[PDB]
Structure 1
Amino acid sequence: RSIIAQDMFKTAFKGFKDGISAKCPKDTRLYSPDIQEDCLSSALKCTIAELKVLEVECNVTENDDFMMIYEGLNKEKWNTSSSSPRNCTCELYNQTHVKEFVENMERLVQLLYTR
């Protein structure tokens, strides 16, 4: 596991998670992927699309943490492999508020480094 990258994601997820809520409409709801073994690659494509959604509806400019999280998600090469990979649709995930969206985003990124 690349400790250098997990450490930047740690700093970036702490600074980004703290300012949000108050930076977004309470009415903002985002699709929040889980860590089901056979859909991690879907789960990552959906986390990325909805970060974009979080962009256009939130006062997140120009967050150093946000564009670190975002560009990190698109360039890092994760092990998204399993016995039986499947496709999952973004809109079939739960919506939730911003605080739990990145929280779940963190948990997913950690899982990916764990393997």
Structure 2
Amino acid sequence: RSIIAQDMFKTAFKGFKDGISAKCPKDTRLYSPDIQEDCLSSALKCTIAELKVLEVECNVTENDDFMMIYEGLNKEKWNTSSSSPRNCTCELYNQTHVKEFVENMERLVQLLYTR
């Protein structure tokens, strides 16, 4: 369990989830993938893909926190594997407000560091 990377996520997630809402239109919504055992890989690609939809919806085209989060996801090698993997579809997830989106996102990264 890579405590150095996990702490960089933790702080980047706290220093973003607490500022956000205020940094996005109240009516912004995003598809929030969850942690179903067999859809980890999909759930990762959609999380990254809605980050982009959040990059034009709000400021965050800059932001130390946003860049660390985004860059971490595309470059860290994850164990997203299972015995019965499945292709989820991003638009089949629940849409949510921007703050809950990063919370779930924090939950998806904690899980994949646990395995």
- Residue deviations 1:43-92, cap 9 Å, x none? 00000000000000102242100000000000000100111011000000
- In structure 2, list runs of 5 or more residues that go unmatched: none
Instruction: List aligned pairs for 1:1-115, cutoff 5 A.
Output: 1-115=1-115
Residue ranges of structure 1 left out of the alignment (5+ in a row): none
**Segments of 4+ moved more than 4 angstroms:** none
RMSD after superposition: 0.6
Residues 16-40 of structure 1: per-residue CA shift (max 9 Å, x gap):
1111001100111000000000000
Could you tell me how far apart the structure 1 residues matched to 2:68 and 2:55 are? 13
SS of the aligned residue for 1:68 comes to: helix
- 57-66 or 94-103: bigger deviation: 57-66
Bigger shift: residues 53-62 or 38-47: 53-62
Deviation at 1:107, TM superposition (A): 0.3
User: Shift in Å at residue 110 of structure 1?
Assistant: 0.1
CA distance in 1, matches of 2:104, 2:31: 10
Give distance in 1, aligned partners of 2:111 and 2:12. Answer: 17
Query: Which whole-Å CA distance do the structure 2 matches of 1:63 and 1:86 have between them?
Result: 34
**TM-score, normalised with respect to structure 1:** 0.98
Corresponding residue pairs, total: 115
**Identical pairs, percent:** 100
